[PDB]
């Protein structure tokens, strides 16, 4: 089973620069509970925007250059990738734009994070269609202390 997460500003932004502006640590601890102990596939440009090796995770970046760190595992198309993860349950895939698009045809589930919050940005998460995706749970909360904007999690499933 293949799973995409990611966190969405208004009007489906999901980056700027190569960088996320904001800073939602509820958020990023929701991307680090559903990630753990499963791998994740991500596409250079975010491989270069985290900056370092997830851990507790088999980090597989997608380039059609050769690899350059051998802390995570390279791989040059969408189905080395998915045959890289092995038999496990269930393969995260956490972007950028460029990758969310190539894996979303081949999804069973999104978790996503609807954040209350306008962004000028240059990457989009990939237009997809409402009719095929049953919402299966939510959760809004609102701004506080740690966590400047509202956000809402949501996990659909493909229907
Ligand atoms: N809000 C969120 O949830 C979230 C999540 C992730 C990322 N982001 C943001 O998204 C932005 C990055 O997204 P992006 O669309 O520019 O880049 P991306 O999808 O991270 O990376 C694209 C690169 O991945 C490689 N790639 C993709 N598909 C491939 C394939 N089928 N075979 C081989 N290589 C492939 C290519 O690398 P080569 O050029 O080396 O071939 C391509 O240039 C940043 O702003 C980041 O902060 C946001
Ligand atoms: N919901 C969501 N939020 C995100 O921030 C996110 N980010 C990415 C890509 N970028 C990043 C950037 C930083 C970290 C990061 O620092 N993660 C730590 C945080 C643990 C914590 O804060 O509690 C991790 O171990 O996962 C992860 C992904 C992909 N999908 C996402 N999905
Ligand atoms: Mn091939
Ligand atoms: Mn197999
Ligand atoms: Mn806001």
Redesign the pocket.
């Known amino acids: 089973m293949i799973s995409l ?3 969405l500003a208004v009007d489906r932004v999901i980056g700027m620069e190569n960088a ?1 502006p904001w800073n ?2 509820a ?10 102990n499963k791998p994740v596939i ?1 596409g250079r440009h ?1 491989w270069e ?2 900056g370092r090796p ?4 088999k980090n597989i970046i997608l380039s059609s250059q050769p690899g350059t760190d051998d802390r995570v595992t390279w791989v040059k198309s969408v189905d080395e990738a998915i045959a890289a993860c092995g038999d496990v349950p269930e393969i995260m895939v ?3 734009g460029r990758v969310y698009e190539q894996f979303l045809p081949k999804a069973q589930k999104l ?3 609807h954040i209350d919050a306008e962004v000028e940005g240059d990457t989009h998460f990939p237009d997809y269609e409402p009719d095929d995706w049953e919402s299966v749970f939510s959760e809004f909360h609102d701004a506080d202390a740690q966590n400047s904007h509202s956000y809402c ?1 949501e996990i659909l499933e493909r229907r």
């Open positions: 997460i990611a966190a996320m939602l640590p958020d990023l601890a929701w991307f680090k509970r559903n990630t753990l991500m975010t925007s985290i997830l851990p507790g995770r956490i972007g950028g978790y996503l994070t999690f």
